[PDB]
Amino acid sequence: MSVSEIFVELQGFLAAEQDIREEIRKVVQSLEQTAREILTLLQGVHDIPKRCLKAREHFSTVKTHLTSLKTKFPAEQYYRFHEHWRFVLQRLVFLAAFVVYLETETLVTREAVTEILGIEPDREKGFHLDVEDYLSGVLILASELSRLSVNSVTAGDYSRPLHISTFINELDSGFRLLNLKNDSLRKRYDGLKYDVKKVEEVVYDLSIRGFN
Amino acid sequence: FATMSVSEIFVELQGFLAAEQDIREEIRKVVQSLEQTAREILTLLQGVHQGTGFQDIPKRCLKAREHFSTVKTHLTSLKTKFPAEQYYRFHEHWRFVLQRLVFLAAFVVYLETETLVTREAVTEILGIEPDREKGFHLDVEDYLSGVLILASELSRLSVNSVTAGDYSRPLHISTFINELDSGFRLLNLKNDSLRKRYDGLKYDVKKVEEVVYDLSIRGFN
Amino acid sequence: MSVSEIFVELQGFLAAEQDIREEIRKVVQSLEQTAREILTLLQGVDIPKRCLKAREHFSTVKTHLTSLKTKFPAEQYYRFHEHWRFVLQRLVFLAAFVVYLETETLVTREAVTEILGIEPDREKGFHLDVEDYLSGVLILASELSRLSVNSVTAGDYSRPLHISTFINELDSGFRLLNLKNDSLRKRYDGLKYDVKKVEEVVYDLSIRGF
Amino acid sequence: MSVSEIFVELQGFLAAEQDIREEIRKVVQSLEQTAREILTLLQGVHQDIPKRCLKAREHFSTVKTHLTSLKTKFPAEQYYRFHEHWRFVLQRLVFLAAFVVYLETETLVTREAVTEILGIEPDREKGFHLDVEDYLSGVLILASELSRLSVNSVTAGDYSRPLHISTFINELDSGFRLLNLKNDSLRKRYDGLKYDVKKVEEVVYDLSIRG
Amino acid sequence: FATMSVSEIFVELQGFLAAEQDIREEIRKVVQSLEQTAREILTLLQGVHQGTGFQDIPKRCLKAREHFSTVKTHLTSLKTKFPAEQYYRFHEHWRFVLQRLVFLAAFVVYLETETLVTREAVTEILGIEPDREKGFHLDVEDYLSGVLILASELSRLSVNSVTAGDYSRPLHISTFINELDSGFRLLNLKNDSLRKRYDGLKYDVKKVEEVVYDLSIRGFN
Amino acid sequence: MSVSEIFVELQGFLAAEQDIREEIRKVVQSLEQTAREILTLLQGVHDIPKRCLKAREHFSTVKTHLTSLKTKFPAEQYYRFHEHWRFVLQRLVFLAAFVVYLETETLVTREAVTEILGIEPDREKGFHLDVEDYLSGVLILASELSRLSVNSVTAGDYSRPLHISTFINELDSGFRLLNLKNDSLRKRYDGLKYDVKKVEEVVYDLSIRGFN
Amino acid sequence: MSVSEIFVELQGFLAAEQDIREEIRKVVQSLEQTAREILTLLQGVHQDIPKRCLKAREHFSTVKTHLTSLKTKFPAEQYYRFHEHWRFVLQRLVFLAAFVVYLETETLVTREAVTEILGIEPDREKGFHLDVEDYLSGVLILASELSRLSVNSVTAGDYSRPLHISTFINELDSGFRLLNLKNDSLRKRYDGLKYDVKKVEEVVYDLSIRG
Amino acid sequence: MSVSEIFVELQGFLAAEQDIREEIRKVVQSLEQTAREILTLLQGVDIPKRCLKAREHFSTVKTHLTSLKTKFPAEQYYRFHEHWRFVLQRLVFLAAFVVYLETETLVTREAVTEILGIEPDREKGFHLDVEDYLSGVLILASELSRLSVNSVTAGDYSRPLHISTFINELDSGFRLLNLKNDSLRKRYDGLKYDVKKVEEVVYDLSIRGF
């Protein structure tokens, strides 16, 4: 083709792609919104089960909104616009993990988060939760949890710290089994040591003071 | 399933991470080869920028097209190191090279035909396939970058053509780089990296125009 | 007009503008001045007496601001706004600081305009932009976090708990804002450290037994 | 009031402000578009000059309706507040208009004449203006574009335009000299004129030596 | 010899560069293994920082010393990937790990004996040799770093010992970290990286002192 | 040993090593001095053979000074204090290369530079010239040479540019045969393209003007 | 003159200046050394206190001869010119002297008293002085070291020192309050006092609650 | 003395010092002022007439400097030196700029001291430090490189060749200096670009035929 032809045609393609980036940014703007709302419901901790339920309830909207975001591009092109919802997906994993931790004191599985976010497993096509974002959200949870232990002592709840300690310590232990390569992820993992250290000191302050 | 132990979860993820790391490894392996052939192809063509060699453009074009043959097998190999639907996942490992190959394919086409390779013709040369066939594709962002690079090489080429006596290519290059400038102008570049690279085109346009000015003034219409 | 006619003309417009920037910069200098004075009165933290002396100084602020109001047209407000931003924001902080110290509540954006003698958004002449107001609140959280620390070393073991609750409400309130202003977000990332510090102070007290 | 009340209210204002910026960007995008379309019509020069000029003026028409449209997307008192969203385009439009005028009159358009072409309102009016800084920018852009023009002229056979542009640019430089550039961004851009001056002059030189 | 062509020179250098690249590759390979064992060794010992496990320090020390066995074979292997006289040439590839191993060897020794491993004893544990035997050595800069790291772990350890009821280790750790502080003070640290790391010791000293203060106040002399 | 013993002993070792770093810095200060002197003798180009001889003559002092620097540490510890003379060694390779280019219009071999700097080949022990520093000095020469071509035209010497062009172009071609990995080196190689481009334009200006 | 003449001359001056810095660093290195040696003698505290003090004063002796030596390595008019080469050590020596005095008199050494111990000359004299900024630094260092001391005191059985140090530090804080710290580096270091104040106070608290 | 006695005393010394910094900063403000004026007179590049008007202004510089001489003791010169560095260096540049424009030679450090009315190193009271002098020379090379460019667009085709030779001598002269001053080296890395630009200007002329 002639230069002119080539470019008028690439103009089409460009505009078609910018449409997609727009539809995705639209929904992602909805997700970050909901995520903030869920954060507040939960942040209240600083009636757990009620907060947890109103939160799992909010995740409902994330389910429909995500299946909506699912129709703004062909599934096989997920990873092309990943960076438009990375931040959000990592927050939502954290929030889901936070809910599960608060109600069972356990670590949501990657497969269980997919279920909560109306997402589907890697087996299928469409929207999926990659291992790096999950590990990310989990690390964010450790940060939240270490902060929580602090506040629980000033709330008078001298037991949570001890459970959180064992939990974060297990996470630390978990991450030790991995040989992280990703620059962002590793820079974050380097923060676990601080959360781990903080919780151990909180436990220490209690042990010395009497409770245990 | 329901719930698992922290330990089970991380031992499981340990599998995936290591699997993922293997893919990147194969990919970097093959990509290393690609960047390699690309270097050798670039040399064969760069022979035009040193007086001689500019005497048998056909010959160079043939061997360069000869090389694109290994690029075909290496690319269908690289196609085996990862699952096709995860293209944009590892895409960064081969970006730089892909944009290089686009420019090289376009350069060879321009030396022979003095026209701009189509995006789709570029894919037939690299041994890959269009958007209509699950596999390895050439995104528009990469094609446009390779074309911008070509604009730079051709501005360098007009200058050397003159010192080599060829006073005909500069004029065709000026017309051509102007058509590319106009072509780019009818776009709404959003990608910052690309929009940045496009700010350089203005300079190539300028350079190639002054060469034509130099020849015009010397007495060559 | 001729090429020369055009530039001798603009020369005039440029000189006129630079005159505005100069008068503005003069008064602004007076504001930064009063601001530092007020900050000192408050930094001393018989504190409720300081509020009054502070509230007193805001009077010079009133006059000086209505003064600055005549160094440029009320229409071209955002044409020179970047000459008093720092000061306006600093001022919002002090006012809120005073209001927090005596009422332990957050000044409203509209009350702060009254205190600085600057008319609200309905009445034209000089408005207090949301971004600036919010910037002042942020600087307030910054100060409040430092206060709790000194409050503890001062004997007061109750302010730290109130400050903590307040700062968290602010955090909770900023979260609700879909902050677009690049500069404002950059500053909002600071609240996080303030919340942490304040919360830790409270932890210390609680662990000690207060 | 309570913190929650204050902020939920602020939420309203911020959401309102963001709508305006959106409407503004929506229109500006339309301004940059037509600008590029105008640029191209003129770029054809690098006679036939007159023809293009008419098609360029024909286009500034929509610029008039789109700018009066953008004028209804926000209050006049907030012009300078969102100036940046259209700074680039405004300086771009000044250049074009100025370029069109030069091609058909070899004279420098006036700041007020430009406002009349863009369908904007002069100094004696509110809403949309034409800040001196932006005006001067457009003129500098023009200097640049004309320096290219002379080079491209000589290569077309037109050994005349060069000389005129040379003088024209020399006056602009003179104009900018007797001006105390307070701004800093515009100050650097002015450092680029000396180069456009030097260029156009060497062209005159080549023609002078040749004949 | 005399003189050569530009081409001959670069084709020749091409050999060396590729040779050099091979060495770095082997080295990174083995070093990857070392960082690996180091991680597993670190885990075995980190078991002391979680309530239980602090009950059989002997056992952990044995398995950890068990591991240092593979570190011995891997290090005499890594010793084959490059020519001994070029130690400080590739040294950076294994710095981080070496400083890790120093700290781990020192940590194990401290858990068993409550004393500071000598630099030379550390070399006998890693399977390498002293400055008096052409081969792989442990530079003083790396030893001092590993000791600084150990100071950090032990300050963390005193805190956890207390929550685990052991009120005897903190006191020995305080004495020990103080002796290290004093020891460092009689040096003229020039290396910036190390001098920076040493500024952290002051903090560990402080921490361990407050634990002893907490116990003293509670009633434990 | 006891902590005290350990550290008093490491105090010795530290002081012994600081002595070496001092002796080396002393001589290196002599080398940079001489190198500057040689640069001036040569920079005069902007009687070549006289300048070249007074320069090869100055290299004589580098020969004794280097064999002197050779007695400030055991040869097998060369690479431990390499970074103390890297800069200088790369300058001296460049200056040697510059001399040879100016007198034979050829590229000194790495083995010939070792000879000029009183150094000894890789075969022996002691002071040696690594391939990265050599490639570095050569790249510095390309920069000097491109600058020279410019000045030679304003000096009236319309022939040097043509020889320099062919020479730099050969260097460019030479570096294309390599797959540089070193960050510093590659960041420098990225500069050859500018020197190559400049020289081609100088040749271009001449060709158009008449000479060729 | 010619460029060459100017610079070869300048070469002489620069070479001269560098010699002075070298001589200064040579002596300073000796000052930092003895400082560390002094620090250690005192650090033993973390009675026996008096003993150490004498051995510490015994050491400041060489500080006297080394400082009068460093005083002969450059002209008096250039004191502030090379102040930075010994800033660290001077502030370090102030602290030590001050620390020694506190351990034996529980009082704050005077700026002039310190100059007398270091073998330096007071304000009424040239050459080597004792800048107020450096003095205040040393005092802050001291605050820090004393806060550690009380903690370490209680762990030794000495339930007395804590209370005294508490008061002492509270006065220092008071002293620094009625001071308009213009400097900025010293301003941050002062932000550290509030922490030393808070620490020493919690120690008093623990003793108060215990008995 | 008592803990309180000590701080009420230093308070005095601090206030005294801050007074010095204030008087100094006042005069300095006057110098930057005159400096900009002189720069403008020179930036106009009948140039040799500009030198005189320039040489004229340096007279206010003399008085103002001898003025600044009484705002602090001559002994504590380097105790406040970092208040006029920028200005002193700027001034050295102008003087050398004037001397270059009329003599096409490099002012000596001692001549510049005379021009600024500041006594040399032998006579006490106020010295011109080598670092500052050298900094001024560097800023001069900076200006000179810009001059050649405008000189060409102005018609003068001979200054560019002289400027080139001069700048190279400076480069050649700085090379001889074992520059230790971190700041000075940072600035010396700038000469390299100046040499290049100037040399290219000369190339242009030579290629054109001048």
GROMACS .gro file of C-alpha atoms in nm, chain D:
model
  211
  644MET     CA    1  -1.953   1.993   6.115
  645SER     CA    2  -1.794   1.648   6.133
  646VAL     CA    3  -1.500   1.526   5.921
  647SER     CA    4  -1.729   1.296   5.722
  648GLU     CA    5  -1.967   1.581   5.638
  649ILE     CA    6  -1.688   1.813   5.529
  650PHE     CA    7  -1.536   1.556   5.293
  651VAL     CA    8  -1.850   1.407   5.141
  652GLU     CA    9  -1.930   1.768   5.051
  653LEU     CA   10  -1.580   1.826   4.913
  654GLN     CA   11  -1.637   1.509   4.712
  655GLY     CA   12  -1.921   1.688   4.538
  656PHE     CA   13  -1.707   1.987   4.446
  657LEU     CA   14  -1.415   1.775   4.325
  658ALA     CA   15  -1.646   1.559   4.115
  659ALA     CA   16  -1.790   1.879   3.967
  660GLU     CA   17  -1.446   2.022   3.890
  661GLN     CA   18  -1.337   1.701   3.718
  662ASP     CA   19  -1.641   1.717   3.488
  663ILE     CA   20  -1.532   2.057   3.363
  664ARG     CA   21  -1.178   1.939   3.292
  665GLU     CA   22  -1.331   1.646   3.101
  666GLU     CA   23  -1.554   1.869   2.892
  667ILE     CA   24  -1.257   2.096   2.829
  668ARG     CA   25  -1.027   1.811   2.722
  669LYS     CA   26  -1.307   1.674   2.502
  670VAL     CA   27  -1.321   2.002   2.309
  671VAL     CA   28  -0.947   2.065   2.316
  672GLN     CA   29  -0.896   1.725   2.154
  673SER     CA   30  -1.116   1.860   1.874
  674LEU     CA   31  -0.902   2.173   1.858
  675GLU     CA   32  -0.572   1.984   1.829
  676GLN     CA   33  -0.733   1.772   1.556
  677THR     CA   34  -0.841   2.058   1.331
  678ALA     CA   35  -0.505   2.220   1.404
  679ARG     CA   36  -0.325   1.920   1.257
  680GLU     CA   37  -0.564   1.929   0.961
  681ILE     CA   38  -0.486   2.298   0.911
  682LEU     CA   39  -0.113   2.243   0.951
  683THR     CA   40  -0.120   1.985   0.673
  684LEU     CA   41  -0.302   2.212   0.425
  685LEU     CA   42  -0.032   2.475   0.476
  686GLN     CA   43   0.256   2.226   0.500
  687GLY     CA   44   0.191   2.168   0.132
  688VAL     CA   45   0.417   2.468   0.072
  689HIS     CA   46   0.726   2.259   0.159
  690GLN     CA   47   0.179   2.990  -0.711
  691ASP     CA   48  -0.040   2.760  -0.500
  692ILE     CA   49   0.018   2.937  -0.167
  693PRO     CA   50  -0.300   3.149  -0.194
  694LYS     CA   51  -0.528   2.849  -0.260
  695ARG     CA   52  -0.421   2.672   0.059
  696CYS     CA   53  -0.471   2.990   0.261
  697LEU     CA   54  -0.841   2.995   0.174
  698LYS     CA   55  -0.885   2.630   0.272
  699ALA     CA   56  -0.703   2.714   0.596
  700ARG     CA   57  -0.936   3.006   0.672
  701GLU     CA   58  -1.225   2.777   0.578
  702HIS     CA   59  -1.112   2.548   0.861
  703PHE     CA   60  -1.063   2.813   1.131
  704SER     CA   61  -1.442   2.831   1.097
  705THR     CA   62  -1.506   2.518   1.299
  706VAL     CA   63  -1.241   2.649   1.539
  707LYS     CA   64  -1.482   2.936   1.598
  708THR     CA   65  -1.778   2.711   1.678
  709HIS     CA   66  -1.570   2.468   1.884
  710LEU     CA   67  -1.412   2.746   2.090
  711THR     CA   68  -1.745   2.912   2.161
  712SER     CA   69  -1.854   2.560   2.258
  713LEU     CA   70  -1.556   2.518   2.491
  714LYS     CA   71  -1.656   2.861   2.625
  715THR     CA   72  -1.984   2.709   2.746
  716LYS     CA   73  -1.810   2.420   2.923
  717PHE     CA   74  -1.696   2.639   3.214
  718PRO     CA   75  -1.742   2.986   3.373
  719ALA     CA   76  -1.544   3.287   3.243
  720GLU     CA   77  -1.397   3.360   3.587
  721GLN     CA   78  -1.216   3.025   3.558
  722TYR     CA   79  -1.041   3.085   3.224
  723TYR     CA   80  -0.685   3.108   3.358
  724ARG     CA   81  -0.777   2.822   3.590
  725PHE     CA   82  -0.783   2.572   3.303
  726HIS     CA   83  -0.553   2.765   3.068
  727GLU     CA   84  -0.308   2.471   3.062
  728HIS     CA   85  -0.550   2.224   2.905
  729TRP     CA   86  -0.546   2.435   2.587
  730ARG     CA   87  -0.214   2.616   2.620
  731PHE     CA   88  -0.054   2.387   2.362
  732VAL     CA   89  -0.343   2.418   2.116
  733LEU     CA   90  -0.380   2.793   2.160
  734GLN     CA   91  -0.012   2.854   2.090
  735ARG     CA   92  -0.056   2.610   1.800
  736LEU     CA   93  -0.354   2.797   1.662
  737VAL     CA   94  -0.180   3.134   1.696
  738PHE     CA   95   0.105   3.001   1.483
  739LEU     CA   96  -0.128   2.868   1.213
  740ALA     CA   97  -0.334   3.188   1.184
  741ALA     CA   98  -0.013   3.391   1.184
  742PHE     CA   99   0.134   3.156   0.923
  743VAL     CA  100  -0.173   3.190   0.701
  744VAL     CA  101  -0.156   3.569   0.723
  745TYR     CA  102   0.216   3.579   0.642
  746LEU     CA  103   0.170   3.363   0.332
  747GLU     CA  104  -0.089   3.606   0.197
  748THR     CA  105   0.039   3.942   0.326
  749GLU     CA  106   0.400   3.888   0.437
  750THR     CA  107   0.311   4.075   0.755
  751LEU     CA  108   0.287   3.981   1.124
  752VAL     CA  109  -0.071   3.923   1.240
  753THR     CA  110  -0.175   4.129   1.540
  754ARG     CA  111  -0.263   3.970   1.874
  755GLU     CA  112  -0.617   4.107   1.834
  756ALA     CA  113  -0.647   4.003   1.470
  757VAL     CA  114  -0.571   3.647   1.576
  758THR     CA  115  -0.846   3.659   1.839
  759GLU     CA  116  -1.084   3.765   1.562
  760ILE     CA  117  -0.990   3.470   1.343
  761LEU     CA  118  -1.019   3.215   1.626
  762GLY     CA  119  -1.367   3.347   1.700
  763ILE     CA  120  -1.241   3.459   2.040
  764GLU     CA  121  -1.303   3.793   2.216
  765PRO     CA  122  -1.033   4.065   2.248
  766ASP     CA  123  -0.898   4.222   2.569
  767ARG     CA  124  -1.213   4.434   2.609
  768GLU     CA  125  -1.409   4.125   2.714
  769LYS     CA  126  -1.415   3.824   2.950
  770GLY     CA  127  -1.435   3.448   2.898
  771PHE     CA  128  -1.171   3.344   2.645
  772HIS     CA  129  -0.874   3.571   2.578
  773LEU     CA  130  -0.529   3.526   2.424
  774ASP     CA  131  -0.257   3.560   2.687
  775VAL     CA  132   0.050   3.754   2.568
  776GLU     CA  133   0.274   3.459   2.659
  777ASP     CA  134   0.082   3.226   2.427
  778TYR     CA  135   0.077   3.485   2.151
  779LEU     CA  136   0.453   3.531   2.164
  780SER     CA  137   0.494   3.153   2.159
  781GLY     CA  138   0.296   3.120   1.839
  782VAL     CA  139   0.509   3.389   1.678
  783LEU     CA  140   0.829   3.203   1.771
  784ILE     CA  141   0.686   2.883   1.625
  785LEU     CA  142   0.620   3.087   1.309
  786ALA     CA  143   0.980   3.208   1.295
  787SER     CA  144   1.086   2.846   1.304
  788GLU     CA  145   0.841   2.740   1.030
  789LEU     CA  146   0.949   3.029   0.803
  790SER     CA  147   1.318   2.943   0.833
  791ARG     CA  148   1.231   2.599   0.700
  792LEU     CA  149   1.019   2.764   0.431
  793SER     CA  150   1.302   2.969   0.277
  794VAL     CA  151   1.523   2.658   0.250
  795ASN     CA  152   1.232   2.477   0.094
  796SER     CA  153   1.166   2.783  -0.122
  797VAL     CA  154   1.506   2.790  -0.289
  798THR     CA  155   1.468   2.421  -0.365
  799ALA     CA  156   1.145   2.504  -0.550
  800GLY     CA  157   1.291   2.780  -0.768
  801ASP     CA  158   1.150   3.066  -0.562
  802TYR     CA  159   1.469   3.263  -0.497
  803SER     CA  160   1.260   3.554  -0.371
  804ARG     CA  161   1.072   3.450  -0.054
  805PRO     CA  162   1.404   3.382   0.127
  806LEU     CA  163   1.509   3.747   0.125
  807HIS     CA  164   1.171   3.867   0.252
  808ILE     CA  165   1.159   3.605   0.528
  809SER     CA  166   1.514   3.704   0.624
  810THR     CA  167   1.407   4.061   0.684
  811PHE     CA  168   1.083   3.955   0.854
  812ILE     CA  169   1.266   3.727   1.098
  813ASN     CA  170   1.528   3.995   1.163
  814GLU     CA  171   1.253   4.233   1.272
  815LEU     CA  172   1.099   3.971   1.501
  816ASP     CA  173   1.438   3.919   1.664
  817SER     CA  174   1.460   4.295   1.697
  818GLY     CA  175   1.113   4.298   1.846
  819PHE     CA  176   1.196   4.028   2.102
  820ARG     CA  177   1.517   4.209   2.194
  821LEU     CA  178   1.348   4.524   2.320
  822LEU     CA  179   1.137   4.300   2.541
  823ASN     CA  180   1.214   4.198   2.900
  824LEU     CA  181   1.110   3.832   2.888
  825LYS     CA  182   1.009   3.763   3.249
  826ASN     CA  183   0.862   3.419   3.177
  827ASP     CA  184   1.116   3.134   3.172
  828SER     CA  185   0.963   2.873   2.942
  829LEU     CA  186   0.914   3.139   2.674
  830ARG     CA  187   1.266   3.259   2.751
  831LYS     CA  188   1.424   2.934   2.636
  832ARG     CA  189   1.206   2.916   2.324
  833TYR     CA  190   1.337   3.264   2.242
  834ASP     CA  191   1.692   3.128   2.256
  835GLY     CA  192   1.587   2.930   1.951
  836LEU     CA  193   1.521   3.239   1.738
  837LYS     CA  194   1.890   3.326   1.701
  838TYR     CA  195   1.919   2.994   1.520
  839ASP     CA  196   1.628   3.065   1.285
  840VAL     CA  197   1.785   3.405   1.224
  841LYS     CA  198   2.123   3.252   1.143
  842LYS     CA  199   1.962   2.992   0.916
  843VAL     CA  200   1.754   3.224   0.700
  844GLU     CA  201   2.060   3.449   0.671
  845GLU     CA  202   2.289   3.177   0.536
  846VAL     CA  203   2.021   3.111   0.272
  847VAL     CA  204   2.037   3.476   0.167
  848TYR     CA  205   2.413   3.434   0.159
  849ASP     CA  206   2.398   3.133  -0.074
  850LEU     CA  207   2.165   3.317  -0.310
  851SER     CA  208   2.384   3.627  -0.292
  852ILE     CA  209   2.698   3.429  -0.381
  853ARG     CA  210   2.519   3.232  -0.653
  854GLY     CA  211   2.330   3.517  -0.817
   0.00000   0.00000   0.00000
